[PDB]
Amino acid sequence: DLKLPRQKVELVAPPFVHAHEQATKQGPKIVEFKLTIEEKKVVIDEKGTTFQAMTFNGSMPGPLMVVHEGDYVETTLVNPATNTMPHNIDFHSATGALGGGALTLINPGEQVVLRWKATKTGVFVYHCAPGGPMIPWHVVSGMNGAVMVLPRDGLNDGKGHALKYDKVYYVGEQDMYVPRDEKGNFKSYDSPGEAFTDTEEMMKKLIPSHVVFNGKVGALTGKNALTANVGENVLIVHSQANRDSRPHLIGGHGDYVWETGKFGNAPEVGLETWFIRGGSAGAAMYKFMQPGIYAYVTHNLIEAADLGATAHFKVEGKWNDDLMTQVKAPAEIP
């Protein structure tokens, strides 16, 4: 029935985001995406702790999908025979059938094609949700990402002015539940199935062992720090499919923040810390004013420093002594 132009997208791994227009002169299209599920054992910390991950496209989070209001999003979800479990996909951006979950349950060896109309603007979670107790388990195993549905005129500040970002990053935060043995060491398992009983017992106690960005402690640091220049406006999309988070850019602010993540609402301005409700994505933009290192954290600092939830930005440019200066360096007290 639907006679619109088709456009394929090549997804890219987080924290990067596939190329897209903000404001566009294009009308509605069918935008085609493919997600291939991968179950795999991964390392999640600098001590070598392992984890039975379940992923869309091999990454935690799954990749960010970007479309415009009124596009139709046509996703081919593939569950190769090399996996062990059934999986599906639920888009919080979509209307009907449990977000798509009730139309996309696929066994290993199967694929399915779902299309949904992007009638709601904002950033939104997508996640697997097979049914029953499997729902939380697949999500906290890594099976979640986000989609961004932009207005065709791009973003605005609510107050008729345009808000154009120079770059966008997607920070997906993952609460992980890795059981410990009697010694107190993290356990390793041979399969997701074998991890399930211990993992569920821990999950129900509601305290994660690890809280990470991009799948691992330190993932968004060093060579893989986020980057900017003084003068650049950066959009940071943050998602958490299961548990609340409170993002904060140390040394910066949220100049324009949609903490509930939905562009039909004006952004708030000048925030220190914002709040991502578990089961949602939000977004914050900041124009960098100072060079140097920044940390981007959840501002439960225990989670940030001790459980994994810290990213870095490395920012180039000229220091602004008007905004901040060390008037007197450390010295002996007179």
Next chain:
Amino acid sequence: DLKLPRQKVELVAPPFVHAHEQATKQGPKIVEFKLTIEEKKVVIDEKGTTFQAMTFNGSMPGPLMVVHEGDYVETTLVNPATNTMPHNIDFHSATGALGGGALTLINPGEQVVLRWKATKTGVFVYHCAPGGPMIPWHVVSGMNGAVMVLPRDGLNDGKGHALKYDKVYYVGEQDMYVPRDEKGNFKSYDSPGEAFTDTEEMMKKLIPSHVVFNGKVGALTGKNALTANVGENVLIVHSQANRDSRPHLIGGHGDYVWETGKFGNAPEVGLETWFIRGGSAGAAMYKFMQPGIYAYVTHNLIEAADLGATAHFKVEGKWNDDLMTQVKAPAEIP
């Protein structure tokens, strides 16, 4: 002194809400309600776990009371001699005397009559609050409900347009603390008093054993699923007297949401997930667009699927293939 017309309300058990007008041509009235406290042992899960509940009117949550701005709410609170503890009531909608708590402490065998003027619009928690450590204990035992104070002109979107609901449901969420024995089985107690010491020890550790809607796992499912038709605008009032929640309608949205619950503020639009602060009520309206089953959850999915916090909607009507369609059913990967 107060010479206004009196109107009695017949309260109904949640999730239903007693009949009321949205917009009204009535002026201020004294609206009369009766709440009768019931302490009782109840079953809270499908395994037969029991719980020493304390309730207003026999239900968890207590019933929703609905009035209009400027009405006077006159409540007869009754504590029959068949109960064991003193109780009172604190309305977050009311001004003075600890919400009414300091004027309503009644022993078993007593009743009291409190009147308060509804000067603040929104949905608000009411709860028992006897004093000291008894406050949390009575609340987490079930002694909480909500009141809705509507503008006399009904609801609006902040942007001069009316927002009329076709039906309203009240979802009260309850965090419950049921201790376990050494075996690991939930304990049963002969009285609230006997449950207190173990229950308080658990409460202070801040992790519930159960998180339920309408008093029990599965209460708002099956025969007791919530219902709608495509085209119907449904208001969902959600309260949590002690602990945060993050509501989400799986397969839908919050079209208009007052997450802080107060109608003097415009609603936010197009939300995926919203946030009910512990100690508050919020409200979300959605116009259903697709038939089928929806789940209404807190989007800590562990709480939703594993601890009890899932309701269903069953929606009748015609499927909309424009909004969503299964382009290709599950098939072998080529």
Next chain:
Amino acid sequence: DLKLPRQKVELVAPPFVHAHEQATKQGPKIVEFKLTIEEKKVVIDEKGTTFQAMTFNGSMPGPLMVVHEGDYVETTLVNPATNTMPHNIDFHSATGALGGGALTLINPGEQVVLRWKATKTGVFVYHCAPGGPMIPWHVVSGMNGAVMVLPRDGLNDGKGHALKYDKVYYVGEQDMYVPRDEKGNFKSYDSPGEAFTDTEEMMKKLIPSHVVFNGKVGALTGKNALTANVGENVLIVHSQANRDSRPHLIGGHGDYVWETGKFGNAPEVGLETWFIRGGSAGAAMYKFMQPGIYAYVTHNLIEAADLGATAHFKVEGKWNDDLMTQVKAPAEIP
């Protein structure tokens, strides 16, 4: 370079706030503050539990600093040789160098002078952040306070009208992690260093032993209750540097609330309970309408009543029977 008038402030201990103007005809100044770090063992509850505290100026929270937009805040941070650890300061109000942390690390026996321009209005956290795992530890040991950056025209309601407070209080909420021995009694330690290993193990489990206002259970009660009169508009600044909170004034409301704490955004009106994201400050104003005792709590009532997080207001004035009245005192049920 910077040729502006200098003004010294004499800080005062919380919950009080140093004298300041709301609206002002002054232009930008360099406003000079001194903070002297004190490590000390303190008592945190009515049972005599002790705690290895680390503080700015001897208090938990650190004192509230108040300036106006466009002022330059010049802080002399002093770490006397009587302390054992290095410390620094990070202002969420400031731009660059990790909020100032990267320019203020001082060993015992040293001081440093940092200046930052107050370009963002609102209430903001400041805290120590030495590096790595020390960050959460210093914060949850007490090393956090707040700064308020007022518009030069004072506060407004977003809807061109001025919002002038008669008094302001600063409530700093502190999550504390005191380990227990095998008996189940709280442990005492001879130094912060000696407390670290046990304290960090507990911190990572994310459940505080105590949640207090102004450093101790009952600090803002009795002789030290907050006070007001009927007719007075009181601003309550609330901060939490590490963990969420949900403030509520029992028997009152938040008439005007900036829960994210930033004055470039209009306040919300008529709230029951608001939400302070961990890592932030917020503010609420209320005009008292009734005399008597109020409790100001976090509305996780377990935290409020059982873990320490309750303050009182004692309010003088005339009872308003229109707003609330006890129609019939407790009596036997007919």
